[PDB]
Amino acid sequence: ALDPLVSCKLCLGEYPVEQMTTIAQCQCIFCTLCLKQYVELLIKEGLETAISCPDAACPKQGHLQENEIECMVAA
Ligand SMILES: [Zn+2]
Ligand SMILES: [Zn+2]
Question: How far is the CA of 56 from the centre of ligand 1 (A)?
Fold first, then answer.
């Protein structure tokens, strides 16, 4: 009865699985907001960074795409 679900790490907020999006290699969970404001900034550039998981402490540190991402934001 009642429990701190939690999920995202960039904001350690509280949200279900339908309110989040997977990375693309490590299979992590991050609310669009963060997972977005983070990449949305880089994805737009493309100069470098390769947009890596927002979890510097990720056991897989999976990277993200430049299109697939910008597609979920800058369609
Ligand atoms: Zn978040
Ligand atoms: Zn990760």
Answer: 14
